C-alpha cells in the first residue's frame, strides 16, 4: 500500500495492490499499518457504514458535519468509477478553501482519509458506480450540513458532459463563503482537537 | 435495519432498508446503534478491510484464524450475489457443529456477523461479485487456516451448476472432525473471551 498526501491537510489517498487469481481480485482498501505511518494515528473506531450506488453524472456533496462533534471518514469507490472531491472547510486552516480531487476506478483503486471538518462530494462518471465509506459517527439528520457543490468559484471537476444530477437538498445548500459568514463551518483547531481523540492509539 | 440470529451462536444477519430515488441507491450496512442492539457492544475496532471480488462458482472457505489470537469479522456483498455460510468451529461451542447461510443479492441486501472463532466460507453465485469485510485484526497468512468446504459432513450449499472453482490450499484442507481431532481448532471460551475484549462498550 502506498499513501499520498492530498493537498487539503490532513487528507490522505492510498493506493492499494490489487492481488489476482483463476478466482478473481482482492484489495485491503484499508490497512492499519499504512494509515498509521501516513496519519500518525490509527482509524477512528467505525459507527457507521455506507454503500450509495450512483447513475452517471450524479453529483453528491458538499456534505459536512456540525463540528463539534464532526465526522472523520474513509472513502472508496468498489465498482464504477468516481472523481473524489476533498473541500477544506475548516476555517483557520492552511489549506482552507482548496480542494483536492482523486480518480477512482476499479483499475487502479484508491481510496481516501477525509479528516474531521471537511467538506466530501463526488461526481460519478460511470453508471452503477459504488462509494463505500466508513465514518466515525452515525448520520444524525441534525448535524449534516450541505454546501454548493454546484458553486462557480470552487470550480470543482463535476461536469462530465451532462447535466449534473443533484439532489434538491444538495442544490439548495449554501456556498462555501456564506456558511463562513454565518459562523457555519467547523473551526481548524477544533477540528483537529477532535480528530486526535477519535485517532488517538488506544 | 432488522437483525436475526444465525443458527451458530452468536452470529447475526442484519438487513438494511433500500433508500432509492432518482440518483441512486442508499444502504448502510453497519449501524452502531442497531449492533449494539443485538450484540450487546459496539463492533471491534477495524484493523483492515477487504474487497474481494470472484467469478461466478468460486467457492471460498472454510476459512479461520487461529484462536488466540482469533478474528471477527463483518461481512456484506457489494455487487454480485454470494450464498454467504458461517461455520461454528469453535470446540465447547452450544451450536458446535452446525451451519447457517445468509443469500446476499442486490436487491435484498444483507450483512453478516461472525464472531471471534467460527469459519467462513461463501460461494459466488454470478461474476463480479464483491465480498466485502472489516475485520478485527489484519491477516496474517501463518494464522489463517482452511477447513474443507465439500465435507459430507456439512453438506454445504456450494456446487451450483458448474465446476466449483477452488484454491489449491482449500481444495486439500482438512475436514472440521478431522481438525478437531489434530486439535487445530479455536476453543470456545477461549474465542468468546477475545470477543468480549473487541467489543466491550467504551
Given at each position: ?63 459536512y458535519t456540525v463540528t463539534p462533534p464532526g465526522t ?81 468559484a470552487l470550480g470543482l471537476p463535476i461536469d462530465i ?34 480528530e486526535r481523540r477519535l485517532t488517538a492509539v488506544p
Amino acid at each position: 500500500m502506498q499513501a499520498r498526501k492530498l493537498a487539503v491537510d490532513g487528507a490522505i489517498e492510498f493506493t492499494p495492490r490489487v492481488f489476482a487469481d483463476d478466482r478473481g481480485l482482492l484489495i485491503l482498501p484499508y490497512q492499519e499499518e499504512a494509515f498509521v505511518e501516513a496519519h500518525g494515528g490509527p482509524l477512528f473506531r467505525v459507527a457507521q457504514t455506507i454503500h450509495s450506488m450512483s447513475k452517471r453524472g450524479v453529483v453528491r456533496g458538499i456534505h459536512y458535519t456540525v463540528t463539534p462533534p464532526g465526522t472523520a471518514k474513509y472513502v472508496y469507490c468498489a465498482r464504477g468509477k468516481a472523481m473524489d472531491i476533498v473541500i477544506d472547510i475548516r476555517v483557520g486552516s492552511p489549506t482552507f478553501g482548496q480542494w483536492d480531487s482523486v480518480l477512482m476506478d476499479q483499475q487502479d483503486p484508491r481510496a481516501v482519509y477525509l479528516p474531521v471538518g471537511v467538506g466530501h462530494a463526488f461526481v460519478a462518471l460511470e453508471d452503477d458506480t459504488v462509494m463505500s465509506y466508513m465514518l466515525s459517527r452515525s448520520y444524525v439528520t441534525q448535524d449534516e450540513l450541505a454546501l454548493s457543490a454546484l458553486d462557480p468559484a470552487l470550480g470543482l471537476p463535476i461536469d462530465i458532459g451532462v447535466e449534473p444530477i443533484v439532489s434538491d437538498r444538495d442544490r439548495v445548500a449554501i456556498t462555501l463563503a456564506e456558511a463562513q459568514r454565518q459562523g457555519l463551518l467547523p473551526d481548524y483547531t477544533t477540528s483537529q482537537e477532535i480528530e486526535r481523540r477519535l485517532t488517538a492509539v488506544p
